[PDB]
Amino acid sequence: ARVKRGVIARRRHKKILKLAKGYYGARSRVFRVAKQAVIKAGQYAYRDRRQRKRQFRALWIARINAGARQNGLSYSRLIAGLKKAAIEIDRKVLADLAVNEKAAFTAIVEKAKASLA
Amino acid sequence: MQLNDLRSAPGARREKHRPGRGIGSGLGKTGGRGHKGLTSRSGGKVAP
């Protein structure tokens, strides 16, 4: 029983070369270079699911700082004031109100201020 | 009771493990011999 490798080997190389679509030069058309490019792309994607959550908290916090100082308060003093009174609203929701619903953000900043913080 | 319906009891037959077939098998590359030495080469046996 002699087994020939032609059909199975070709099917396996085409799966890798389809994931390497859009890469530059030999990274999208030769198997040896495209195999390493696909592995490193998956290494980056695993790490950047952690970094996506970090990059978005930093963006919300920076926008909350800009909106609070327009009402006479810094970010660190507003967070302490919110925790003092009641509020559990996310940084994600807070950054949305700072840009879109500016009259609601002012009310929250004014209530956090009234907690003497 | 047909020829395509009868088998053996569980645990009666195994597969044998083949060294040197990829990473996922647990026996790839060196095949269970470790690194360089006498007992890592063809015919590398220590006399009784």
Binding site: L59, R63, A66, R69, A95, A98, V99, N100 | -
Partner: protein, 142 residues
């Protein structure tokens, strides 16, 4: 419910005029770079320029503390062997007064295509007047 992102075609930019008439160089320059980048607006996003325009008028009357008027040096290399050249704060004010403020602000901005775009919105002059009356800049107290 995704996160808001600013669009370069729909950004609102203002004009401001800042007088350097006895301000410390580095504490004035940090306020300028903060507004060139748009960090004072809730619409700020890291990849689009949301900042304002800053005009600086009395660029030769900026000051430094300590003994920095004579002891602070500016170096640059021309690319030729031995081509290192230096000038101090006192002499640079005499020759190119505006280069003092630009050098300080430029070092506080990102070093990429976006950082060079924010720098293009800084207009530094050495008089008490600027050529940008048609834009009607509003006063900014430090």
């Amino acid at each position: 419910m995704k996160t808001y992102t600013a669009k370069p075609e729909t950004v609102q930019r203002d004009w401001f005029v800042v007088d350097a008439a006895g301000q410390t160089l580095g504490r004035l320059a940090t306020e300028i770079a903060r507004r060139l980048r748009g960090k004072h607006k809730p619409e700020y996003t890291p990849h689009v320029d949301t900042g304002d325009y800053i005009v600086v008028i009395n660029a030769e009357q900026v000051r430094v503390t300590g003994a920095k008027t004579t002891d602070k040096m500016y170096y640059h290399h021309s690319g030729f062997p031995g081509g290192i050249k230096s000038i101090n704060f006192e002499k640079l004010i005499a020759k190119a007064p505006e280069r003092v403020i630009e050098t300080a602000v430029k070092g506080m901005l990102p070093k990429n295509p976006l950082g060079r775009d924010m720098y293009r919105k800084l207009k530094v002059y050495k008089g008490a007047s600027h050529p940008h009356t048609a834009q009607q800049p509003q006063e900014l107290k430090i």
